[PDB]
Design a protein around this ligand. Sequence first.
Ligand SMILES: *[C@@H]1O[C@H](CO)[C@@H](O[C@@H]2O[C@H](CO)[C@@H](O[C@@H]3O[C@H](CO[C@H]4O[C@H](CO[C@H]5O[C@H](CO)[C@@H](O)[C@H](O)[C@@H]5O[C@H]5O[C@H](CO)[C@@H](O)[C@H](O)[C@@H]5O)[C@@H](O)[C@H](O[C@H]5O[C@H](CO)[C@@H](O)[C@H](O)[C@@H]5O)[C@@H]4O)[C@@H](O)[C@H](O[C@H]4O[C@H](CO)[C@@H](O)[C@H](O)[C@@H]4O[C@H]4O[C@H](CO)[C@@H](O)[C@H](O)[C@@H]4O[C@H]4O[C@H](CO)[C@@H](O)[C@H](O)[C@@H]4O)[C@@H]3O)[C@H](O)[C@H]2NC(C)=O)[C@H](O)[C@H]1NC(C)=O
Ligand SMILES: *[C@@H]1O[C@H](CO)[C@@H](O[C@@H]2O[C@H](CO)[C@@H](O[C@@H]3O[C@H](CO[C@H]4O[C@H](CO[C@H]5O[C@H](CO)[C@@H](O)[C@H](O)[C@@H]5O[C@H]5O[C@H](CO)[C@@H](O)[C@H](O)[C@@H]5O)[C@@H](O)[C@H](O[C@H]5O[C@H](CO)[C@@H](O)[C@H](O)[C@@H]5O)[C@@H]4O)[C@@H](O)[C@H](O[C@H]4O[C@H](CO)[C@@H](O)[C@H](O)[C@@H]4O[C@H]4O[C@H](CO)[C@@H](O)[C@H](O)[C@@H]4O[C@H]4O[C@H](CO)[C@@H](O)[C@H](O)[C@@H]4O)[C@@H]3O)[C@H](O)[C@H]2NC(C)=O)[C@H](O)[C@H]1NC(C)=O
Ligand SMILES: *[C@@H]1O[C@H](CO)[C@@H](O[C@@H]2O[C@H](CO)[C@@H](O[C@@H]3O[C@H](CO[C@H]4O[C@H](CO)[C@@H](O)[C@H](O[C@H]5O[C@H](CO)[C@@H](O)[C@H](O)[C@@H]5O)[C@@H]4O)[C@@H](O)[C@H](O[C@H]4O[C@H](CO)[C@@H](O)[C@H](O)[C@@H]4O[C@H]4O[C@H](CO)[C@@H](O)[C@H](O)[C@@H]4O)[C@@H]3O)[C@H](O)[C@H]2NC(C)=O)[C@H](O)[C@H]1NC(C)=O
Ligand SMILES: *[C@@H]1O[C@H](CO)[C@@H](O[C@@H]2O[C@H](CO)[C@@H](O[C@@H]3O[C@H](CO[C@H]4O[C@H](CO)[C@@H](O)[C@H](O[C@H]5O[C@H](CO)[C@@H](O)[C@H](O)[C@@H]5O)[C@@H]4O)[C@@H](O)[C@H](O[C@H]4O[C@H](CO)[C@@H](O)[C@H](O)[C@@H]4O[C@H]4O[C@H](CO)[C@@H](O)[C@H](O)[C@@H]4O)[C@@H]3O)[C@H](O)[C@H]2NC(C)=O)[C@H](O)[C@H]1NC(C)=O
Ligand SMILES: OC[C@H]1O[C@@](CO)(OC[C@@]2(O[C@H]3O[C@H](CO)[C@@H](O)[C@H](O)[C@H]3O)O[C@H](CO)[C@@H](O)[C@@H]2O)[C@@H](O)[C@@H]1O
Ligand SMILES: OC[C@H]1O[C@@](CO)(OC[C@@]2(O[C@H]3O[C@H](CO)[C@@H](O)[C@H](O)[C@H]3O)O[C@H](CO)[C@@H](O)[C@@H]2O)[C@@H](O)[C@@H]1O
Ligand code: NAG
Ligand code: NAG
Ligand code: NAG
Ligand code: NAG
Ligand code: NAG
Ligand code: NAG
Ligand code: NAG
Ligand code: NAG
Ligand code: NAG
Ligand code: NAG
Ligand code: NAG
Ligand code: NAG
Lengths: 624, 624
Amino acid sequence: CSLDQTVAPGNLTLCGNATLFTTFRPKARFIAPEGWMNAPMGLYQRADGSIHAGYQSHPKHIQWGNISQGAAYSSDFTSWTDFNGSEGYKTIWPSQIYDIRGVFDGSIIKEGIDGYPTILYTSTSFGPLGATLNEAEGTETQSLAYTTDDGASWIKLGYGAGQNPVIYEWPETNLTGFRDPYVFQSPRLEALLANTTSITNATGDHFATISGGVHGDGARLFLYRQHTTGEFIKWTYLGPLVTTGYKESYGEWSGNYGINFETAGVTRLNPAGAAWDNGSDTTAVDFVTFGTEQGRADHQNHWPLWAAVDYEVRDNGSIEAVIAYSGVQDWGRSYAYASFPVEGYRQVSVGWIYEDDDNVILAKQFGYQGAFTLFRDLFVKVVENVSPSTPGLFEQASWSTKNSTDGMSVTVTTLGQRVVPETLAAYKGNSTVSTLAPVMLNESAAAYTPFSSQPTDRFYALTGSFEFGLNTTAKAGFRVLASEEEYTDIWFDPASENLTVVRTASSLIKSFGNDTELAKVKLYEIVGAESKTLNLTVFVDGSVIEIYANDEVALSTRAYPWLANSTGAGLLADGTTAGDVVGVSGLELWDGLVDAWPARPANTSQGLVWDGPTAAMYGLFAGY
Amino acid sequence: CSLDQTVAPGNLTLCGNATLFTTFRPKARFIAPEGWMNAPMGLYQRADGSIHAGYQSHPKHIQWGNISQGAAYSSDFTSWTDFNGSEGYKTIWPSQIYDIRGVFDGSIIKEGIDGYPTILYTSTSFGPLGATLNEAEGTETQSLAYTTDDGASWIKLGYGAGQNPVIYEWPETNLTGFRDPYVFQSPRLEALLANTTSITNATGDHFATISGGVHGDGARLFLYRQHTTGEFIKWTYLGPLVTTGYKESYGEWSGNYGINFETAGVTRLNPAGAAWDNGSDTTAVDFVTFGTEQGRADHQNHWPLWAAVDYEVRDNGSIEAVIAYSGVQDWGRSYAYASFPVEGYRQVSVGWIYEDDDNVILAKQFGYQGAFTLFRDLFVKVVENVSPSTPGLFEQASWSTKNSTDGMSVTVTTLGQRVVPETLAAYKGNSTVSTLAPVMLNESAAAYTPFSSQPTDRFYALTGSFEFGLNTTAKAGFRVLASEEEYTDIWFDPASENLTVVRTASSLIKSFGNDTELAKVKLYEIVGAESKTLNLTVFVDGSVIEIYANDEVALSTRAYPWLANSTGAGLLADGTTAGDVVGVSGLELWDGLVDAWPARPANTSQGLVWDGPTAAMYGLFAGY
Ligand SMILES: *[C@@H]1O[C@H](CO)[C@@H](O[C@@H]2O[C@H](CO)[C@@H](O[C@@H]3O[C@H](CO[C@H]4O[C@H](CO[C@H]5O[C@H](CO)[C@@H](O)[C@H](O)[C@@H]5O[C@H]5O[C@H](CO)[C@@H](O)[C@H](O)[C@@H]5O)[C@@H](O)[C@H](O[C@H]5O[C@H](CO)[C@@H](O)[C@H](O)[C@@H]5O)[C@@H]4O)[C@@H](O)[C@H](O[C@H]4O[C@H](CO)[C@@H](O)[C@H](O)[C@@H]4O[C@H]4O[C@H](CO)[C@@H](O)[C@H](O)[C@@H]4O[C@H]4O[C@H](CO)[C@@H](O)[C@H](O)[C@@H]4O)[C@@H]3O)[C@H](O)[C@H]2NC(C)=O)[C@H](O)[C@H]1NC(C)=O
Ligand SMILES: *[C@@H]1O[C@H](CO)[C@@H](O[C@@H]2O[C@H](CO)[C@@H](O[C@@H]3O[C@H](CO[C@H]4O[C@H](CO[C@H]5O[C@H](CO)[C@@H](O)[C@H](O)[C@@H]5O[C@H]5O[C@H](CO)[C@@H](O)[C@H](O)[C@@H]5O)[C@@H](O)[C@H](O[C@H]5O[C@H](CO)[C@@H](O)[C@H](O)[C@@H]5O)[C@@H]4O)[C@@H](O)[C@H](O[C@H]4O[C@H](CO)[C@@H](O)[C@H](O)[C@@H]4O[C@H]4O[C@H](CO)[C@@H](O)[C@H](O)[C@@H]4O[C@H]4O[C@H](CO)[C@@H](O)[C@H](O)[C@@H]4O)[C@@H]3O)[C@H](O)[C@H]2NC(C)=O)[C@H](O)[C@H]1NC(C)=O
Ligand SMILES: *[C@@H]1O[C@H](CO)[C@@H](O[C@@H]2O[C@H](CO)[C@@H](O[C@@H]3O[C@H](CO[C@H]4O[C@H](CO)[C@@H](O)[C@H](O[C@H]5O[C@H](CO)[C@@H](O)[C@H](O)[C@@H]5O)[C@@H]4O)[C@@H](O)[C@H](O[C@H]4O[C@H](CO)[C@@H](O)[C@H](O)[C@@H]4O[C@H]4O[C@H](CO)[C@@H](O)[C@H](O)[C@@H]4O)[C@@H]3O)[C@H](O)[C@H]2NC(C)=O)[C@H](O)[C@H]1NC(C)=O
Ligand SMILES: *[C@@H]1O[C@H](CO)[C@@H](O[C@@H]2O[C@H](CO)[C@@H](O[C@@H]3O[C@H](CO[C@H]4O[C@H](CO)[C@@H](O)[C@H](O[C@H]5O[C@H](CO)[C@@H](O)[C@H](O)[C@@H]5O)[C@@H]4O)[C@@H](O)[C@H](O[C@H]4O[C@H](CO)[C@@H](O)[C@H](O)[C@@H]4O[C@H]4O[C@H](CO)[C@@H](O)[C@H](O)[C@@H]4O)[C@@H]3O)[C@H](O)[C@H]2NC(C)=O)[C@H](O)[C@H]1NC(C)=O
Ligand SMILES: OC[C@H]1O[C@@](CO)(OC[C@@]2(O[C@H]3O[C@H](CO)[C@@H](O)[C@H](O)[C@H]3O)O[C@H](CO)[C@@H](O)[C@@H]2O)[C@@H](O)[C@@H]1O
Ligand SMILES: OC[C@H]1O[C@@](CO)(OC[C@@]2(O[C@H]3O[C@H](CO)[C@@H](O)[C@H](O)[C@H]3O)O[C@H](CO)[C@@H](O)[C@@H]2O)[C@@H](O)[C@@H]1O
Ligand SMILES: *[C@@H]1O[C@H](CO)[C@@H](O)[C@H](O)[C@H]1NC(C)=O
Ligand SMILES: *[C@@H]1O[C@H](CO)[C@@H](O)[C@H](O)[C@H]1NC(C)=O
Ligand SMILES: *[C@@H]1O[C@H](CO)[C@@H](O)[C@H](O)[C@H]1NC(C)=O
Ligand SMILES: *[C@@H]1O[C@H](CO)[C@@H](O)[C@H](O)[C@H]1NC(C)=O
Ligand SMILES: *[C@@H]1O[C@H](CO)[C@@H](O)[C@H](O)[C@H]1NC(C)=O
Ligand SMILES: *[C@@H]1O[C@H](CO)[C@@H](O)[C@H](O)[C@H]1NC(C)=O
Ligand SMILES: *[C@@H]1O[C@H](CO)[C@@H](O)[C@H](O)[C@H]1NC(C)=O
Ligand SMILES: *[C@@H]1O[C@H](CO)[C@@H](O)[C@H](O)[C@H]1NC(C)=O
Ligand SMILES: *[C@@H]1O[C@H](CO)[C@@H](O)[C@H](O)[C@H]1NC(C)=O
Ligand SMILES: *[C@@H]1O[C@H](CO)[C@@H](O)[C@H](O)[C@H]1NC(C)=O
Ligand SMILES: *[C@@H]1O[C@H](CO)[C@@H](O)[C@H](O)[C@H]1NC(C)=O
Ligand SMILES: *[C@@H]1O[C@H](CO)[C@@H](O)[C@H](O)[C@H]1NC(C)=O
């Protein structure tokens, strides 16, 4: 095993465990110290204002198993500190018959058991578990634990009648899944249900959704309500909140609803952020965010989606969330988005970016798998004075339109996402910032034009505003992690409305994924404008490439170039001419970003272990 | 619910939990503080000379489940103190994927991991588990834990490759069971295998048996040897030690070998007690003790047996224990005998006495189930100068015979059992002792003759020597727990060789078992004697009646008389005449015995709990 990054890569499968630990590793974002991670969980803002972030964790392994909550905290979403207790950075782990198969995703009741922060989580036990298997009742249940030390440790309720697990009966037969409880308060839902509480007797101030579906008949999001305020044992099933069809698709802008939901949550937003009104705010919109499985040919069969919904009250005292429009939270290699409330009327969302090594060829050599996305403020994105001649505008696919009284302009509403300002400020302030001169891309434009200032490593951010003609057929964008022989191309093609990440040359190492990523982006044309603009921001962080367009479209992906000098970046141009010109302005490079884990050494591997021959006997975990 | 024991019992099923806690409860023996107990486990003499006793335990329940090690200690086998830690009186419990279904029986390596006492135990996980089910590999494995605080707590080895569980591969396919590891040192077996260690490479000083069987083909005791001295991870399977047939019986004196062995152990004894010679002691005999299941129509389908064995060395470096003669360790409601070494060349055996409420009618009202037997010294019982005209003597069923050179007398050898002297001394010294005049039972004998001194409660011991004519047809014995309306009759009938416990009148409460207990007892007639003698000792301890004959035959059973005055005792006589006389001598009553748990209050119930609806979902434990 040679680690010489000045020559072509050898057979890297001969390299030892964690020998490639630092080679491709993000430095500027949330990531476990080592080993396997997946979904964010247990997210909450603590009493001191800091953020507690949990994650699905399997230390010293590079595949999923014995799944536990790893945890850390931060005052600014950006610089983090690991918890360190008797189980290292874990704070909840399988320990009881009801959760011994895995401590799955859960969410936080801020004022819970004895007034303490309390997690409601999916406690798993034995038996077939999965949307494509014959799962039975009891395999997935929902259980409580609380913390008396602000997340350093959690105490589970006892096992038994009137204690854990607190939710165990399936609300309908033949479920594809029954997990990922999302607990939330909702003045909106309370107001809607207030006239029906005699029917159900459920009057608590917390609601919970559980994600699942029904075999052969599509996904379901089940709504429960806390039966009595201040009491956390009894949760009353109201009814299905979201019901979709077996592999139903709302269309090209909306992914596919698959067969089963995972990590679903419910929020209410207005243009500024989170909305906590009872329905009286006419600018507020109700949203559900949710993962779907088995409705996609690639990306691990997973779509991270969202929908704007209009609530209807059923005669039996339940709520139907009728989908008004439906979109995609991230178009790339991410999933398991969780959102949580943050002071100052914010709702913040974060997901998991998986690797692109699905055949598990170099995972042991990494010594870890997975990272988070950046933390994102959610809000209602409102675009005013939109031209009615914007192509495809009245499809109203993942947005709504409201015509002006005179019919000459439109107001567009959709889900907005932007990186939390704390992270952008910290990134910029710790980076070498190069403000770049604007560039007209015309007949003289090369295919690739390096920026006048270059990155010094694989940790940087770039932004630019690309102004296109209304009938352009030109393509433009950014090339990143670039040398002569390796590079990743991010293109926007206004004629097709497609944002693509072409990865055919991303790496000389042939075992990593190289499929082209694709997102749809609607450039809402403004009344009186003779052009249309794409604001494109890209974060490069080890192997992560995380792309944001117009505070709306997100696409996370992976690139693993071998060569030490595959760090460059610049502008891409295709079919730009004297007549079909792309004006690029607002160009800026941030080199360095932030060291997100200042207390960690460069190599936090503790080695990898094998569970031994019993892993295959039990049949629950891969064992490595 | 009336608790008036001066009148007939009402409907006691209306009584609350643990309302009958003290009514029938043993006071003079080892018993858990409350709830369910079964098999003794983890038995060892600690460095300070005290005895550590573990037991299969399910606190706050009255059926088996979440099975754990409860523990206590004693300096004299007789007066005990509970451990008290974070889990009350438990010291090992289900906590890992490999043992979450139950911490089953295990035994002690005195100088184990890092020099500490170490338990090798059956760690159970999910799946069908049982001799009549389709069990698979992995459901029962064997794991290690060690104690740094003399049994107050145990630390398990980690889960994984080269750690726990340490034995997981089935030695043969289609096992009926794979549990109850019994670890022991054996100069005998080491000497026998010393010439074959090149074949197996197993040279350690500890052996371990694992109890089981093969579907359709009878029970098996599998022999392992520690691969290397001072190392405890690697155990090498040598071969089957004991192989018996599907429901094979050695005869009327030997129970039935059933389909599967449980709690089997291996020892070597001589007339004084334990023998640690390499084979050079010609007075020493190798014994296996073992439970069998599904070879009995009653007594929970369970026989606690023993066999004298002659070891043969196989060509593959394993040992065949060929059964020379075969007997019964206890003929009544006991099972799960464990034996362990005690200083002064002793091997001490103790079992579990279950209740006689198999339909679980009053178990909740008790608030507990089960107790131990008394602790018993094992030894080789040798009877000299036996008359060749002793009926059935040369059947050599559960004994061996050696003729004198002249053929006129025989030496009989069998397994001896007697209550440990520490317990007899403590019992006698703390009791009101009445030494009773001898009684000739003849034509004037009533059916029942009360002793001249009577017990004052349900805690007493009695002994007597019954001298019978060689051709008697008379029966005699003891009546205990007796009033006019309730009593339990213990009869010996020399003509049939049957010791019986008739329980048709044991209690006015009709839900308890009332079947007649039966043991075979061989009165070895002595050359020149014109009579034959039965030495019969009976311990009455709450509901336990524990009977010993001739330091050889043991029979444990249960009686639950309701009336407060059903405590009396005396002599039984049937068919005694002027000519057929039974001389009773050496009569003595010990009233009171010992308070075995002096620190415990009278009622140590902590209430009972229900596991809730998930118990049936998981399908592992009854849930109460
Ligand atoms: C199979 O068997 C298994 C083993 O038996 C069984 O698991 C066990 O289940 C039981 C029962 O559910 C659990 O017991 C509970 O424990 C809770 C606390 O748990 C935390 O702390 C314990 C103990 O910690 C000590 O010991 C450890 C180990 O040495 C140390 O690490 C600690 O530092 C600490 O040490 C100190 O104390 C020791 C003595 O205890 C000393 O020896 C020592 O020197 C130190 O001084 C830990 O062991 C726990 O860890 C385990 O669990 C966590 C997850 O929780 C895992 O991550 C971890 O790996 C371990 O597995 C854990 O950290 C108790 O709070 C709980 O007690 C209450 O609940 C019951 C009702 O169910 C009540 O009877 C009781 O009164 C308590 O409730 C009161 O208090 C709470 C708040 O405190 C209130 O909310 C409640 O309303 C109530 O209030 C009352 O009192 C108030 C105040 O007075 C009053 O105001 C009110 O009005 C009211 O009256 C319970 O004891 C046990 O933890 C499990 N153990 C394990 C190992 O799993 C399993 O379930 C079985 N399975 C099946 C299928 O049956
Ligand atoms: C799913 O995830 C699960 C959770 O992660 C996982 O279970 C966990 O598995 C790990 C890995 O196997 C276990 O970790 C081991 O722990 C052993 C000790 O275990 C006992 O103590 C711990 C910790 O106790 C502290 O914390 C608790 C809880 O707060 C307190 O109650 C205690 O009082 C104590 O508190 C103090 O310390 C804290 C910090 O640790 C402080 O915060 C605190 O303030 C106090 O100061 C307990 O938690 C354990 O309880 C659990 O387990 C018991 C059964 O064992 C249960 O009954 C109970 O309910 C709990 O479940 C327990 O009591 C460690 O000994 C062990 O460490 C060694 O082994 C590894 C190799 O595997 C080595 O890397 C390491 O070096 C250690 O080995 C050395 O030392 C031993 C002797 O000590 C030697 O034999 C050995 O050769 C080696 O020697 C070396 O050093 C020598 C000396 O320098 C030298 O001479 C030699 O030459 C050599 O170099 C390991 O860390 C962990 O306990 C499990 N936890 C739980 C909750 O289950 C599970 O397996 C996963 N499942 C799957 C399927 O993957
Ligand atoms: C005395 O000790 C007991 C522990 O032994 C304590 O707890 C009680 O334990 C008993 C079992 O011994 C429980 O009985 C079972 O109850 C089931 C139905 O429960 C629901 O209704 C009752 C009555 O209104 C409620 O009290 C329960 O509420 C509690 O539990 C819920 C969770 O469900 C919690 O949310 C609450 O907070 C409470 O904790 C429940 O709502 C019942 O299905 C079950 O069924 C069988 O058993 C009886 C008797 O054998 C049969 O008649 C019947 O046919 C069923 O038999 C089954 O047999 C086998 C399985 O064994 C199957 O093959 C069959 O098909 C069949 O299903 C049983 O009756 C009791 O619920 C529980 N009480 C609790 C927790 O409060 C007592 O509390 C304790 N007393 C005191 C004062 O401390
Ligand atoms: C680097 O990290 C790893 C952890 O990932 C550490 O541990 C190693 O982990 C790997 C798995 O990643 C283990 O590989 C597996 O080994 C199985 C056979 O093991 C035995 O032989 C080896 C080699 O001589 C011994 O080292 C082992 O000894 C250890 O374990 C025993 C317990 O058995 C202990 O008693 C010892 O003390 C040791 O701890 C064993 O004796 C092997 O069966 C398994 O099989 C497959 O995997 C490969 C690669 O994918 C395939 O080629 C092959 O076809 C098998 O594929 C399976 O795929 C699926 C299941 O995934 C099935 O559907 C198929 O049917 C098929 O079975 C695998 O190769 C390795 O044993 C283990 N080593 C240990 C514990 O020492 C490393 O130690 C660590 N390195 C360092 C330096 O720290
Ligand atoms: O960690 C559990 C947690 O993650 C979620 C959301 O993705 O489900 C994950 C899921 O897959 C994981 O487990 C498999 C092991 O077979 C592993 O290959 C995969 O990489 C993991 O993401 O967990 C169940 C059980 O494995 C799968 O059906 C599901 O796809 C979330 O729903 C859950 O709380
Ligand atoms: O506690 C386990 C321990 O006991 C032994 C010896 O008797 O096996 C007991 C055994 O039965 C127990 O469990 C059943 C529950 O179905 C209960 O009804 C019974 O009263 C208990 O004695 O355990 C297994 C699994 O339950 C049974 O097949 C077996 O009969 C010993 O072998 C083991 O270590
Ligand atoms: C980058 O590295 C490769 C391999 O060392 C080399 O061939 C190339 O010239 C380097 N310089 C660049 C891309 O500017
Ligand atoms: C569907 O549900 C029932 C239990 O409600 C179960 O018997 C059945 O096996 C399930 N699965 C299928 C494939 O029908
Ligand atoms: C309420 O009605 C809806 C629509 O029919 C149904 O899906 C849901 O199960 C009902 N809620 C119940 C039975 O609690
Ligand atoms: C919205 O505006 C467009 C363009 O003026 C028009 O075609 C459409 O009918 C309008 N919709 C409504 C509801 O008035
Ligand atoms: C650098 O990053 C840290 C950690 O996020 C942040 O607190 C600090 O303000 C940043 N430095 C600047 C803006 O100069
Ligand atoms: C644009 O994307 C869609 C997928 O939504 C695809 O069908 C189409 O071929 C793409 N067109 C171009 C030119 O990239
Ligand atoms: C024993 O008690 C019962 C019921 O109180 C009574 O009938 C009987 O006379 C009592 N005395 C005895 C058996 O000596
Ligand atoms: C017997 O053993 C094999 C595995 O060795 C297994 O396939 C089979 O199902 C077992 N049970 C029966 C009843 O044959
Ligand atoms: C040794 O031979 C015996 C008798 O054939 C056999 O039962 C046992 O399995 C053998 N031991 C092995 C293969 O380790
Ligand atoms: C043992 O003694 C009996 C009675 O004397 C006799 O019948 C039998 O043959 C003797 N056995 C041997 C081996 O000499
Ligand atoms: C009474 O019993 C205790 C506890 O077993 C024992 O130590 C003591 O010697 C006994 N009293 C006597 C013999 O007087
Ligand atoms: C004595 O016991 C045996 C069982 O071993 C039985 O067959 C026989 O009938 C009994 N005889 C009498 C008279 O009790």
